[PDB]
């Protein structure tokens, strides 16, 4: 069910006494604002001049507002200069607004949509942002709180002089709810969300949908030779799982798009144990898998004409009497031998088996999503994602463009001859999973992209931007659902 | 069996040729010292003048001493100035004396008690110290040594011109033996003393006494909802236990005094693993529980008119395939959810379940004893205990007074609005068990005292003074039995 | 000059169109609120019911407000429940209000003072908080910014039906300005504020006042035997200074109150060098000296009938060819020899010389203020101060009471026989400045309080609360002026 209830010009009743208007830097840049049958432009101009309301981007102003005999509660959100209003600004505008609406427990209000739409922007971008933020900005994970407040519906009565389509908002809502679905999996405690229960939850979620889900249990995945996934997950009581998700949106026998996700439900580091502060927030080590589920959820609900195969490598990296150790040599699904020198480099191992398995489906492109390396955070900062291409320079360039347009910072790092050679620097095995040298993020990418062969492969290291430690217009602390907006937008263009 | 055998004015035997006298700074401040019927004051004055004997507090002097025809072995212990003789001085005097007696393998000796008693001190304080130190100062844990010497009895023939009651010494002995009982549990190797065997030993010890013992096994803990105790102890082969100890010293119906003890038989830190030097001496992480047992042992043997309920939360904090991890969320006995961010903060977790359980008995006051925080040691040093009050400002003030009178350094640290708020700083659960900020000892206290509600609660962080790395007049290295003297004295006043 | 311009019952001006009212949880608890000649209580009740304004403590609400013809800008600050309104609440109320007024660049406004005063609280407390926060909450240090905005005066036209005395506000302003004076010294860059320039600034500040200032230059220090102050400061190009500040508020010759301040303008740690993050914000290592200056500034401007002598030990702890080293032995002003084992324990060294010098004036009490120990922060947290008494148990108890009443968290830590003995644990000198054992804050206090002899001495370790890393109702990040409110209040009661 939805956080907001969107209604278009159905009725105008005495029950409702709350009004929402967007305020730009220059009011004359909009078509004269009118509520009921009265022009209210000059009264808003006086309130702006008195500094009772303002235009600062995303700032909330409230005031008592008289129109005719009735006194209304006016809610103002600043739009800034309409000429220089970015997509980020739109997210900030809708974000702060819906957050205010929810925290003030407002159940019934008018929304003057014409004050948000300018001559400068296309209708779809404003309504898309409106739809997404109505779910994404108002997200909360209070399921384990004893003092959780009862969920309520906010009725938004949209008033527009020339608007009929409401589909662009409903499109945004389904994307926003897909992001929140990913967030829910990520926020889940590791003692509750194990590889098994994670698989079971995915099955139950897609049970009555067009999306097919296959779960490969522990004794199947070992006998089928998933050696690396076995190695990583064997140290836990809760054994690893492989989840295959298929969505046939165009139904043609056409080569699917492979989306691979790292589903490490908890990472202790294994025998290469993490520090005290290092283990904090390690339930978020499966964000990659969660975000893949979100992308497929969005694609299916939007009924996009695309074929997608999703592969999730789920495991729990734990210490016990028989868990993986440095010096251990395992046989990958590819048949290649891998020497493990660092058990905290577990992500690239499970991705390797998953990528090789994904390539069996003969996809047009493979995209993997993982919270892999600390070095990627050191490289680009906590708020940007690292992207690596292997035989897919063109598809990456499109994604780097799309991401910059949807307020998601993604930047390229290289895979050179150095990294292609150094993954083979083992005295015993075909491959090694760790280097003591620098450029560790590049090494990890080289390791993962090796298993795709010549198939176009993009690796996304989202160790940084997958989570945030600061609340914003995009929602509270925790999982961000990073990449979902970018990939969905890219999928829309296929 | 007792270390010393106290006999009052027993026949002056020719088999005995050893003599003990206390020597003050001024011999004229005492009643003329006489042995047999002979006045020996002047001869002791000459030996003091020749520096053959002296008065320095707790210093042992020995000499050949002629009285009549027979040559005696004279043993002298300094008393210092009798005007300025503290209770600590008395412990130092009796402590060093009985230690010398035991190391010299003396089996039969006279003790001139009149030389130890002055007009300035209370007779009861001297004889109390005498009784305690006869057991406490002479303590040794040589049960795992192959070269352990055979235990022997020292016959102390007390000579006093005007003394009849010997009950104040026997009172001290039973207190001293209670301290040693606590020490025995603490010194026990962790591979021998597990939560199960610890519970079993308590049952067997109180089997034929007025003290009732109930043991709650692992299956009972889980089905009754001891979630936090379960969480801490599940990682060990030796599963947790809850031990309930009841002593009804006065009445069936009068509100008991709750004594809660942390019984972590071994603390590795869990996945938040300790350093090499950090794990050393971690068998002492159950000193709190051991000292509660000691307090109840003393109260019952002294037949004090008080009702006591003792609750011990026993577990072993270990690493395995399914042990607790940072990010884990558990349901406490209170019904509240707790996010675990640091598995080395295990003490406050087991105390939380124990305190809530203790409060079901509707006690007049709850007192918990635990080796909790390193920050408490940083705060007050290794030799002082940290005390925290919650709705019991008055009872604490009495205890702070009593402790300073029985040579036990205990000082107050605060629980403010800051700490009461910060235990709730979790993005997912009702409570969090760890802060990255400072004032960690205050946080831990706030966490523990939360579970008592409005019931008067005093928390004792004895991480420092529960053990000593230096031998002294109070005994050898290891467990000190800290707080036992203070609480017993407080219980005597109810 | 002043940040706010307070005018009481000033002429009704036709140009002022801004109005400030305090809003409680129940409006009927106040005397019926009236502006101009109109009762506005029931119109405010409707706005509160519509959630246009509210009562949440310290929350700002604004709205268009019609009274008669003219439309006013109404500014509302919540007061909460008037029955349970603490002094902290008052600071939060005035703090957030004046911060809003300044950030909104408001130059002329009405203030309905009667809405802030209740039958439940003392009048003097409301106006005191109003005065302090008008300066303290609005503080900014933008002197080194190129884009610093021009300072402006806000005219506050107070409207009260029964109020004449304005002196309680002017009293608060002078206290607030004294806090800001201390903040200015603390915020000053260490390459600008050296011991010399710090001394020069103090001279120039008190030049035309009742306060006398004496500066002891480097040559005078060594020749007069300030050995410890010399030792600490000799490694810098900018040599140490001793600043003596005398204020005779009552009597030509009556025992003064000694206020000693640590004036380390910069602390690198010396040869016991700090880490990278350790040196950050070390210009605040002279907050103690700055706050003493603030206290004396407040006392003199309030013309309090007290005698005060202020002693400031100013130095810069630097590394060079001849700076102090571990193993160095120096002769203190007392004539005692001190072995330096840790050059980062520089504070206790300069305080020692300053305290001994202060005692020459034969004060009734000595109070020192210093950012000394990291262990004090570990003990009580970053937001509380550690207080230690030596022969002044009574005066401390009064200060601990006063502080809790003026929203300043100060708590006692002990100085025991252990600490009194351990400061003498040197193989070579009379004293040692550092222990490798725990309880380091207690050790430091013992070291400092040693030099006062038997004179009543209170030591304040303000390492934590002297600075804040978070903006609040008390002002921006940086120096807090901690202790100034507490000591001034204490001085008012002499
Ligand atoms: Cl505009
Ligand atoms: Cl193999
Ligand atoms: Cl990895
Ligand atoms: Cl296949
Ligand atoms: Cl291959
Ligand atoms: Cl002595
Ligand atoms: Cl004497
Ligand atoms: Cl749960
Ligand atoms: Cl703990
Ligand atoms: Cl019960
Ligand atoms: Cl409770
Ligand atoms: Cl009220
Ligand atoms: Cl409130
Ligand atoms: Cl010298
Ligand atoms: Cl220091
Ligand atoms: Cl002088
Ligand atoms: Cl001295
Ligand atoms: Na490849
Ligand atoms: Na992050
Ligand atoms: Na409590
Ligand atoms: Na003193
Ligand atoms: Na600080």
Question: Would you list the DSSP string of B181-217?
Answer: HHHHHHHS-TTTS-HHHHHHHHHHHSTTSS-EEEEE-
Task: Please give the order of strands across the beta sheet that includes B241-248.
Answer: B212-216, B241-248, B307-317, B257-267, B365-370, B457-461, B385-390, B410-412
Beta bridge partners of A248: A307
Q: What are phi and psi of A353, to 5 degrees?
A: -65, -40
Active site residue B348: yes
Measuring CA to CA, which residue among A377, A319, A356 is closest to residue A431?
Answer: A356
Q: What is the Cα–Cα distance from C347 to C326, expressed in whole angstroms?
A: 15
The CA A213 to ligand 8 mean position distance, Å, reads: 27
Measuring CA to CA, which residue among A174, A181, A211, A212 is closest to residue A198?
Answer: A181
Comparing CB atoms, the residue among A144, A276, A319 nearest residue B428 is: A144
**Reduced to 3 states, what is the DSSP secondary structure of residue B412?**
strand
Q: What are phi and psi of C397, to 5 degrees?
A: -55, -40
Q: Which of A274, A325, A420, A492 is catalytic?
A: A274
Q: Label residue B168 exposed, middle or buried (CB < 10 Å: 0-12, 13-18, 19+).
A: middle
Residue B145's contacts (CB-CB under 8 Å, 6 or more residues apart) are none
Cα separations (Å) of B299 from A128, B178, B257, B491? Answer: 74, 9, 12, 8
DSSP string of A262-279, one letter each residue: EEEEEE--TTSPPPHHHH
> CATH classification of B3-160, choosing from 3.30.70.980, 2.40.50.140, 3.40.220.10, 1.10.3720.10?
3.40.220.10
Instruction: Judge whether C413 is closer than 8 Å to chain B, CB to CB.
Output: yes
DSSP string of A205-273, one letter each residue: HSTTSS-EEEEE-HHHHHHTT-HHHHHHHTTSSS--EEEEEEEESS-SS--PEEEEEEEEEEE--TTSP
Task: Please give, rounded to a whole number of angstroms, the shortest distance from the CA of B274 to a CA of chain C.
Answer: 19
Q: b or e along B154-164 (b: 16 or more beta carbons within 10 Å of the residue's beta carbon)? A: bbbbbbbeeee
> CATH classification of A166-494, choosing from 3.20.20.10, 3.30.470.20, 3.40.630.10, 3.20.20.70?
3.40.630.10
Beta bridge partners of A275: none
* End-to-end C-alpha distance for chain B, whole angstroms: 30
Residues 421-460 of C with CB under 8 A from B: 437-442
Residue B39's contacts (CB-CB under 8 Å, 6 or more residues apart) are B32, B33
Measuring CA to CA, which residue among C469, C475, C476, C481 is closest to residue C280?
Answer: C469
Active site residue B241: no
Q: b or e along C72-107 (b: 16 or more beta carbons within 10 Å of the residue's beta carbon)? A: bbbbbbbbbebeebebebbbbbbbbbbbbbbebebe
Q: CA torsion angle for C231, C235, C237, C243 (degrees, to 10)?
A: -30
The answer to whether residues C177 and C170 touch, using CB atoms and an 8 Å cutoff, is no
> Where do you find CATH 3.40.220.10 in chain C?
3-160
Size of interface A-B (CB pairs under 8 A): 74
Instruction: Judge whether A65 is closer than 8 Å to chain C, CB to CB.
Output: yes
The answer to whether residues B439 and C380 touch, using CB atoms and an 8 Å cutoff, is yes
Measuring CA to CA, which residue among A248, A261, A279 is closest to residue A344?
Answer: A279
Residues 99-158 of A with CB under 8 A from C: 104
Q: What are phi and psi of B211, to 5 degrees?
A: -85, 125
Residue B354's contacts (CB-CB under 8 Å, 6 or more residues apart) are B229, B242, B260, B261, B311, B312, B313, B368
Residue C393's contacts (CB-CB under 8 Å, 6 or more residues apart) are none
Residue C360's contacts (CB-CB under 8 Å, 6 or more residues apart) are none
Q: Which of C239, C348, C384, C440 is catalytic?
A: C348
Task: Please give, rounded to a whole number of angstroms, the shortest distance from the CA of B416 to a CA of chain C.
Answer: 9
Task: Please give, rounded to a whole number of angstroms, the shortest distance from the CA of B54 to a CA of chain C.
Answer: 24
Q: b or e along A187-213 (b: 16 or more beta carbons within 10 Å of the residue's beta carbon)? A: bbbbbebbbbebbeebeeebeeeebeb
Residue A135's contacts (CB-CB under 8 Å, 6 or more residues apart) are A2, A3, A4, A172, A173, A176, A177, A179, A180
| β A385-390/A457-461 pair status | antiparallel
Instruction: Judge whether B379 is closer than 8 Å to chain C, CB to CB.
Output: yes
Instruction: Compute how many other C-beta atoms are within 10 angstroms of the C-beta atom of residue A49.
Output: 9
**Reduced to 3 states, what is the DSSP secondary structure of residue A300?**
helix
Q: What is the Cα–Cα distance from A445 to A375, expressed in whole angstroms?
A: 12
Measuring CA to CA, which residue among B452, B436, B453, B435 is closest to residue B444?
Answer: B435
- Enumerate the residues of chain A whose CB falls inside 8 A of the CB of residue B344: 276
**Reduced to 3 states, what is the DSSP secondary structure of residue A19?**
strand
Residue A226 in tokens:
């998933």
**Rounded to a whole number, what is the largest CA-CA distance in chain C?**
86
Task: Please give, rounded to a whole number of angstroms, the shortest distance from the CA of C64 to a CA of chain A.
Answer: 6
Q: Which of B274, B420, B477, B492 is catalytic?
A: B274
The CA A457 to ligand 3 mean position distance, Å, reads: 17
Instruction: Judge whether A17 is closer than 8 Å to chain C, CB to CB.
Output: yes
Residue B210 in tokens:
């007025």
DSSP string of C237-281, one letter each residue: SS--EEEEEEEESS-SSS-PEEEEEEEEEEE--TTSPPPHHHHTT
Q: Which of C274, C325, C420, C492 is catalytic?
A: C274
Q: What is the Cα–Cα distance from C369 to C347, expressed in whole angstroms?
A: 10
The CA C461 to ligand 15 mean position distance, Å, reads: 10
CB contact under 8 A, C62 and A62: yes
The answer to whether residues C448 and C353 touch, using CB atoms and an 8 Å cutoff, is no
**DSSP state, residue B273:** P
Instruction: Compute how many other C-beta atoms are within 10 angstroms of the C-beta atom of residue C342.
Output: 18
Residue B62 in tokens:
């020995």
Helix axes B123-136, B167-187, angle to 10 degrees: 30
Q: What is the Cα–Cα distance from A203 to A196, expressed in whole angstroms?
A: 11
CB contact under 8 A, B271 and A279: yes
Task: List chains adjacent to chain C, taking adjacency as at least 3 C-beta pairs closer than 8 Å.
Answer: A, B
| Resolution (Å) of this entry | 2.7
Interface test with A, best of C45, C54, C63, C65 (most A CBs within 10 A): C63
Q: What is the Cα–Cα distance from A93 to B320, expressed in whole angstroms?
A: 49
- Enumerate the residues of chain A whose CB falls inside 8 A of the CB of residue B325: 190-191, 266, 268, 279, 282
- Method of determination is X-ray
Comparing CB atoms, the residue among C378, C409, C414 nearest residue B375 is: C378
Task: Please give, rounded to a whole number of angstroms, the shortest distance from the CA of C244 to a CA of chain A.
Answer: 47
Instruction: Compute how many other C-beta atoms are within 10 angstroms of the C-beta atom of residue B103.
Output: 9
- Enumerate the residues of chain C whose CB falls inside 8 A of the CB of residue A470: none
Query: Which helix (H) or strand (E) segment is C39 a member of?
Result: strand C38-39
Interface test with A, best of B232, B268, B269, B325 (most A CBs within 10 A): B325
Size of interface A-C (CB pairs under 8 A): 35
Q: Which residues, by Cβ under 5 Å, contact ligand 4, an ion?
A: A 360
């Amino acid at each position: 069910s939805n956080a907001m209830n969107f209604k278009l010009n159905n009725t105008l009743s005495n029950e409702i006494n709350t009004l929402i208007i967007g305020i730009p830097e220059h009011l004359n840049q909009l078509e004269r604002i009118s509520f009921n049958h009265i022009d209210i432009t000059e009264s808003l101009e006086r309130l702006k001049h008195q500094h009772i309301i303002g235009s600062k981007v995303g700032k909330i102003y409230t005031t008592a507002f008289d129109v005719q005999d009735q006194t209304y509660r006016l809610i103002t959100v600043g739009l800034g200069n309409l000429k220089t209003r970015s997509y980020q600004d739109m997210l900030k505008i809708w974000g702060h607004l819906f957050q205010y609406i929810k925290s003030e427990h407002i159940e019934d209000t008018y929304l003057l949509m014409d004050s948000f739409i300018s001559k400068y922007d296309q209708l779809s971008d404003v309504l898309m942002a409106c739809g997404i933020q109505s779910e994404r900005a108002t997200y909360e994970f209070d399921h384990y709180k004893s003092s959780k407040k009862a969920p309520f519906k906010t009725n938004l009565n949209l008033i527009s002089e020339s608007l009929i389509e409401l589909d662009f908002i409903h499109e945004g809502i389904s994307i926003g709810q897909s992001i929140n679905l990913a967030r829910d999996f990520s926020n889940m405690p590791p003692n509750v969300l194990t590889p098994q229960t994670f698989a079971e939850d995915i099955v139950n979620h897609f049970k009555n949908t067009k999306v097919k889900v296959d779960v490969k249990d522990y004794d199947t995945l070992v006998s089928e030779g998933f050696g690396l996934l076995q190695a990583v997950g064997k140290g836990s009581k809760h054994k690893p799982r492989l989840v295959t998700i298929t969505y046939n949106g165009k139904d043609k026998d056409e080569a699917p798009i492979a989306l691979v996700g790292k589903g490490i439900t908890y990472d202790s580091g294994g025998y290469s144990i993490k520090t005290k502060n290092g283990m904090a927030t390690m339930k978020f080590d499966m964000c990659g898998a969660a975000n893949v589920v979100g992308i497929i959820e969005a694609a299916s609900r939007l009924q996009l004409p695309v074929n997608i195969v999703g592969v999730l490598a789920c495991a729990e990296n734990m210490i016990n009497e028989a868990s993986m150790k440095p010096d251990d040599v395992f046989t990958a699904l590819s048949g290649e031998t891998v020497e493990v020198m660092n058990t905290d480099a577990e992500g690239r191992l499970v991705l390797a088996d998953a990528v090789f398995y994904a390539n069996q489906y003969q996809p047009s492109v493979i995209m993997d999503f993982a919270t892999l390396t600390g070095a990627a955070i050191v490289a680009l900062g906590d708020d940007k994602a690292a992207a690596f291409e292997s035989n897919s320079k063109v598809i990456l360039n499109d994604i780097l463009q799309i991401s910059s347009e949807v307020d998601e910072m993604v930047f390229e790092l290289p895979i050179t001859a150095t990294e292609r050679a150094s993954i083979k620097h083992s005295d015993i095995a075909d491959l090694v999973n760790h280097t003591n040298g620098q450029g560790k993020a590049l090494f990890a990418a080289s390791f993962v992209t090796h298993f795709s062969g010549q198939t176009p492969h993009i690796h996304f290291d989202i160790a940084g931007p997958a989570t945030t430690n600061k609340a914003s217009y995009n929602g509270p602390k925790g999982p961000t659902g990073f990449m979902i907006p970018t990939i969905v937008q890219w999928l829309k263009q296929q």
